[PDB]
């Protein structure tokens, strides 16, 4: 499919049964999801953005179904206002920027 | 061109007779360049991302060439680590996500 950028590119993702909405973010290196409990050992990582840095929990090798496509990757969890699907997961679904 | 997300999607922009790198960001509503001098008056604007909000200077009708494609729109100048090209300008150059 082809997603245009007039509005925010939000797609439905299935994170362990739960269907949430997420933003396809090309400027985001990592994927960051809202504060929730994921199975596994986590590592505190500090990531910075526009405002400043935030403290997140880094979970390795988690699977997320981004718009009907199974993708595996590292998922950071922390105080974010919107679920962000970064480059790490995006590449798995073979997403491209065309213009 | 068809850009893949294996690396940071950086392009060369020409703004004010000068070349500089910019990250093509689909998760960004606005185009935020780093602290630089621009002609014209500005207005106060407050945008927020991960880790809070910041104060940026909004300038309007700025000519900017993103990888050979001209675009004239609003540019925000603020304390950002990387020049960010947001949806506002991505739509002028006809940029789209595909997969
Ligand atoms: C991995 C992580 C998620 C931390 N990446 C980012 O946040 C990067 C950081 N770099 C910075 C960096 C930091 C350290 C090293 N290298 C680079 C600058 C670019 N952001 C990418 C943005 O796409 C993130 C989004 C998140 C968001 C979307 C909608 C609403 C709230 C938050 C973002 O910040 N978007 C906002 C946005 C962005 C610009 C202008 C206006 C707006 C409003 C909004 O669209």
Curated annotation (Swiss-Prot), chains A, B:
This is Protease. Residues 20-89 form the Peptidase A2 domain. It comes from the Viruses. It comes from Human immunodeficiency virus type 1 group M subtype B (isolate BH5). Aspartyl protease that mediates proteolytic cleavages of Gag and Gag-Pol polyproteins during or shortly after the release of the virion from the plasma membrane. Cleavages take place as an ordered, step-wise cascade to yield mature proteins. This process is called maturation. Displays maximal activity during the budding process just prior to particle release from the cell. Also cleaves Nef and Vif, probably concomitantly with viral structural proteins on maturation of virus particles. Hydrolyzes host EIF4GI and PABP1 in order to shut off the capped cellular mRNA translation. Residues 1-5, 49-55, 88-99 are annotated as: Dimerization of protease. Homodimer, whose active site consists of two apposed aspartic acid residues. The lineage of its organism: Viruses, Riboviria, Pararnavirae, Artverviricota, Revtraviricetes. The active site is at 25 (for protease activity).
């Amino acid at each position: 499919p082809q997603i245009t950028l007039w509005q925010r590119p939000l797609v439905t993702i299935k994170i362990g049964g739960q269907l949430k909405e997420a933003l396809l973010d090309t400027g985001a290196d990592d994927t960051v999801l809202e504060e929730m409990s994921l199975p596994g050992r986590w590592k505190p990582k500090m990531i910075g953005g526009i405002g400043g840095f935030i403290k997140v929990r880094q979970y390795d090798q988690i699977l997320i179904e981004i718009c009907g496509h199974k993708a595996i990757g590292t998922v950071l969890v922390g105080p974010t206002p919107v679920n962000i699907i970064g480059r790490n997961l995006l590449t798995q679904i073979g997403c491209t920027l065309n213009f």
